[model samples]
Target: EITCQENLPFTCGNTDALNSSSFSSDFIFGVASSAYQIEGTIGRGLNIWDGFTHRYPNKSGPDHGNGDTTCDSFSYWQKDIDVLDELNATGYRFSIAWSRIIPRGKRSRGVNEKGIDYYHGLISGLIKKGITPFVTLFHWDLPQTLQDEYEGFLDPQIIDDFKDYADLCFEEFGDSVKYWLTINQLYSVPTRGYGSALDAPGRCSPTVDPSCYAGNSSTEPYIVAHHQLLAHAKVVDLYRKNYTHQGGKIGPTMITRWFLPYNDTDRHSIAATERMKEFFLGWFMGPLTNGTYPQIMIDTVGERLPSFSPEESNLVKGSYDFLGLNYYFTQYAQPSPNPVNSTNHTAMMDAGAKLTYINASGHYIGPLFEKDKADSTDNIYYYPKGIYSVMDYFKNKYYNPLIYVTENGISTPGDENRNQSMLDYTRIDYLCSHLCFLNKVIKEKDVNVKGYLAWALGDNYEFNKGFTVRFGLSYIDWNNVTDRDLKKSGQWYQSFISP
Candidate 1:
């Protein structure tokens, strides 16, 4: 068995000896992708991303790249399977495009047979090749029609509409798909879109970004989050009642980050670190597990935070059979003196915590991988131990639910020359270090993590950053969508997963 080494701080162990076989036989080793990021916008309806990027190109990035023809996975899906075969990945995690399947954003508007047939073919191809399909029902590609119709998740009307869409997905694909994820990163939409207007369906108080024409940052985020939880619960409840015959499991995917106090001995910094957890992970985890937001949040945000009805609370609690977690990096937290009642306040200020990459020692939490030269503030760093800390936190505090590492991988700056980029040793090192820490968590803490799917399968249009970042095992030629080639990380992963 793998054991912790004294010198390694984060993982608490050297992981050179760890590999895929170090875990139980049932553990899944795989790669992940999202529809809007990979699949080209062909034969599909428009999503808020389409509207947001096209209407405000400057908001995307200096590269101005959108997903109009990303990796063209819709046409080149065969290449996806081929890459998976090369990696010897036993499982594949991908999201369905809501706009693709239900073009008008509702089943009543009419279903798109072409979209239905496309996923069916893709699923059958994976099954034929012996790869299990882990399907995510939504990955933030909300149909433009829905957003225009009812402001999407901000309104309570979304709960019923989302439930209808989920019912349609189960009715059509439940038999073949055994693993289902209800939403990708529950905190992302509200925080990114409403809190800062940085993502699709961008809406924030004009104070956050003048580009955001409309939204109440303080109130909208909570409302959107509440509706999302309600929608998730409704779908899971439906699946349990109607689709149990299909023999599947469903849950929501949470984007998690380990937080450390900027100054461990400083009581305010220590409290801010815990407060960050309550605002970030616990914002959703607490409601899912205990049917309420953290008391800290209720006391801090006060009336701005929405309250769950008695029936709604009961419905949302214990809604999932499993939990999907996406890990990437960690941050150090210090106390924020910004008052929530200030004129410039947004939901972000509600946490009353300041996040930074460096700690009290004036050093990054881990090694800096790639500094963002194009956008000075968009730099990337790594801290492998964050994965272990996150797992231990969940197991000890969140009732030790069965979990899957739905997405984890680092990215490189996208401007590198093709030849140099394809080498990708940085990506390789990042994955290895994180996996080692993951193994450390399972072996040391007995965290019930059942699978690991790296953030993406190929280079695609990253949200907001556009083409400025590359997070992929395989390389995709934007000039030639048909060209699918394995990078050094892909080759390394293949060997790492082999018997």
Candidate 2:
């Protein structure tokens, strides 16, 4: 029904608008790698992932995780930076490990100079290579000191503590880093902690009494979002006032699996789908976008959801300049009949939405977005056209905030483990198809979607899969962490970037 700019560069039906035509010089082409996943250190601060993989045996692969010596990116960051260069990527998105930066997440305690020096040096190096360093302040690595002080992020103390930590980062690296992500997906930590002890700082403790919940099954999710928003807002304000001299932008990165309503018959389907978004994307975006928690949630969860005092409310609202939407898979959301019941809460399912169950076919149910999970990333059969739809949906709902595809990529067990996978035409096809889809949106939709940073550059220890599920453009040999080779998909993605 609508058309876009004249000489729109290139065209596609539903690809993100930036990809249309050759990417402009200002358009950012980057690959993201996480600190916890890529930087292996037996450091003092123990994160949830570090603890989860180690403490809980058999839950992960026998030889699977504990990235204590992961990729040794900590040591061989130059080699990793070369991967970005090889891809001709303009930017590099990486996180500063909270534990590494501050072994103790406290203001009363001093900051870690060593960690600051290391990160500062790294940022300087990235700039030298002409790779604009995109810094994520905290990527789920709460300092062990904070956990010792008050179970880390679960307590409200985290807001003040995290603010102090951010101040330090702003003071230290704000000069070099322009693109700053305040926190990576604040929703996942609490959810994973409650529903699944699959992560670190594992606390599966349940509460029967509603009043007693503190970031637990009984407490409202707003508790977590409130703190995270305040923390992010505090840092944004800090940068604006104290470190604007650094000349950078700060935002929060949110990862959500969009669930489409599978069937019209189910009354709970659409509501459940919205709940899925509320519980995941809106947890942080709700406040950042509109300045407070969504009303539906407040009405459903009541005072249990917690409200900010007027002053606090203003502070938490509109905290971000942009949004980092990390999209992985889209599936159908099915609702449960019971309005009030308990279920696996981690990963946002823990809140007991009475919606979203994995179907008999092993595909997750919700909004019936994707018909085939196997080829969902590749074919428009599931309608990659939905990118435009989702972007439009977000814009209409959130007033067209700048959106970055913080994460997007497909993966399969590569050939080393499975002979059939070496010839992973599935992944290659999927990459091109999605890139084409993104290009369409850019040239056609005018969605205000500016940039994208793929989930990974090369394979490393995936959170749960460890090194099992390879989602990298360049493949790394698990047996030899130093051995890096480009995969077929990597080649395809690189060529696409050249376009």
Candidate 3:
């Protein structure tokens, strides 16, 4: 019994009862945040985030918040280190903004010295405090220039430009940054940015979201996804081919979720659930692991799905030294219309699945993972076992490469008072529950899972939901943006990390 979760299946607030000793001593216990989420656009050039939040203020949040001066991590990153130090965090995952580093789309345009220095100082500080850094090269904050120049990832031109950007990342920081994540999530930008048009560089079929500038929701997502994969492959190839001496690992971060059949015995639901796995997990994993789209995708997406050239296939296949995976919640999948010919057709619909937090037997997955501040009807539920299931599936199905839980954590409502927010037992419950299952999966399945980093070291600009949600372990004063007060959940993590 290597595990120490007395409050297992239902809840896990017994933080003192669990500790770093439960899992591999080497396992990283820390938190994660993206650059645009934490660092304001102070010293950096504008990205699509600036463009989106301003143009679509309502989309930022009900509060209509923007990242113009988010937690001010650009100035107070050391405070972030202080919070990590306070939590006894062994690892911290953060991103480097391309707009900050290059300011413009192309590296040949110019590199910002101050932008490079900001991260150098942050990385040095993290290392000084005995915390390992997992740096994501891109976190969906594409410089607006790239977006305007050639519509960003929509064009093949993004491949070489991304390669150049990555080359500079490796050249500048490869020495101290050991674990490098090439892209945020292979699925996010393509789907959210192009399909539903909820994210930046927003473009989709007019029928899907007339608000978008322009796009073919069904076709553009595949094109953008194909480019992202190729770009990631090129960067990985460059890192291996040129910077092998750094002895660092590089891989793409995948956002993973465990899906169940909405009606376990129903034939269409079961088939749809299986197809969701292929469309969701297998979409990129197939190319990364096997150099092709999943058979299901090839069969379903048909002419819309892009095929990898023999050379591109060889480049993309086996492109990672490790897999940085982020898991949050699970959903039950039921069949939905493909509607391939509809003007509203989207790449996301290719799976023919409709996701719900409740199953056909009418059971909520587990606990409230996220309360939709925007729409009460769209609340999200979580299953802690989803993390374990994700690990097991990745191992049994995706060849079990060394794994790191790059992002996981729940959000508290943004409107909660400071004191009410500070005493976050629910957040503690959400975190400890997920950690329990992670420990169980590692020991029981012997999954080569190395680390776990909860999302948001401190609250800032949440992408679409904006400041309407707080997903941080340490709460920050939006008014001050200087001091980060470790919440009660953060206090629990401190004790959990203590020797």
Candidate 4:
């Protein structure tokens, strides 16, 4: 069995416990953070997240946590860099706040030089520290102005605005930043933000979530997703045509969840599992790779799903230079006994599959993440094999495009004491187990994964859960906002990555 160093707080007993050295020397090891999730709202224009959380804090979660001043990375960014150095991370995956850079959500509204300089300082510091910057153009922080103007991604007008915003970023930072992620997770904003209204710009059928001021659960989600795909393609085209000389790559990140049959012998359960994959990953990957949505989605959603013109379809096809994949947990899929219930349907439930934690034998798929234990609908089960299965699925089904594990990691409850949080053996085990599978996929399966970035660099505002969960390698003192220390998981990762 592969034995871990005994001195660490956590140890893994498996023959496949490998570290950064197991991959090629050029492979990147890093941590990720998004602007709205980490950077404070100070000196920046408001985004939908700021509006939604403050207007209805309870919508985020029981704690009502908002990103008003989470981490204050805007002011204390240097310390963030120090944490990366301490962890021996070679890359930092962070997003630029569109609202911060263009206060009114349009370049014509006038640029925010202060915002530009803030990122300039951050990028230059990363370069000086010998760390590569993997910048995400949008991480669900759509400027409130844009949303207020034309319903944000719900309208095609966002295509031009997003292009302009990305154009500005390319012109400003393309010289130094070589890795770019266009959007955080394509499946997220559409399903959670629009379909269920659990996230920012919360808008869904009033019956779905009472807090949503307005939305069509059946129609709006598909519309938002279509517009997002168009916007992503438009920006990628511009970058390739205008900024190719800069020597960088760009792609969109997809949130991945492996679905297993609740009853392996039941045909309905197996069919439901495959159908869920179409709605989840194939919802975006199919169009991005093959210029069309999955046949299952087309056949199922029928008229409710949007269609792309020939020109638009061709534009979206092969839009990415690499694929950014974010994986956390897996689920069990069983065919729902009830029909679509068109009158009360929402896009998230259109799959006609019941996702559960337990199988037919009444056994949980795996242990649940500590914080996720409270969730009823989403019973997250940790399964390292899902990582390998996901990577293998992408390689076999999606034509094996260049790939990067953009975001992977687990979260713990934020209410835990500092001492308990620091002794993060659970987090360590989570990382090590996933890495073991990741290493196997790369070495044994030959998946073209060039990099791996943990979900976060430090404790910050989680999108829906707010401050209720911590998914960071380094611990942040939310009260002081300036204090930072590596948790046990971070120390273990440091030793794993250290030369």
Query: Highest TM-score, which number?
Result: 3
Residues 89-127, model 1: lDDT tens digits: 989999999989998998898999999999999999999
Query: Candidate 3 residues 252-294, lDDT tens each?
Result: 9999999999999999999998898899999999999999999
What's the true lDDT of residue 227 in model 3? 97
Q: What clash pairs does model 1 have? A: 5-13
Query: Order of all candidates by TM-score, from best down to worst?
Result: 3, 1, 4, 2
For model 4, where is the 10-residue window of minimal lDDT? 1-10
Once fitted onto the true fold, the runs of candidate 2 whose alpha carbons sit more than 4 angstroms away are 1-20, 42-44, 60-64, 205-215, 220-222, 265-267, 338-383, 418-423
State the C-alpha lDDT per candidate: 0.88, 0.65, 0.90, 0.88
| Worst window of 10 by summed lDDT in candidate 2 | 5-14
Q: Which residue pairs overlap in candidate 3's backbone?
A: none
List the candidates' TM-scores in order: 0.96, 0.84, 0.98, 0.96
> Whole-model lDDT for model 2 versus the true structure?
0.65
lDDT of 4 at 217: 85
How much does candidate 3 score in TM-score? 0.98
Candidate 2 structure quality by residue, lDDT tens digits, 1-499: 2333211222432233323245445777777888888888754466656655766644444355667886777777777777877777777889988878777667566666777877887888888888888788888767666766777666778878888888888878877888899888777655554434445555553533222223354453445556677777878877777876776788888775556665545666777767767766666667777677776666666656767787777776777778887765555666654334553233344334543335335543222222333455433223344455566667777777887777776666533563454454555554444455555566565667777777677787776556556777777766677855666665555665664
TM-score of 2: 0.84
After TM-score superposition, the amount by which residue 430's alpha carbon in candidate 4 deviates from its true location, in angstroms, is 0.3
lDDT of 4 by residue, 87-165 (tens): 8789999999998899899888888999999999999999888899999999999999999999999999999999999
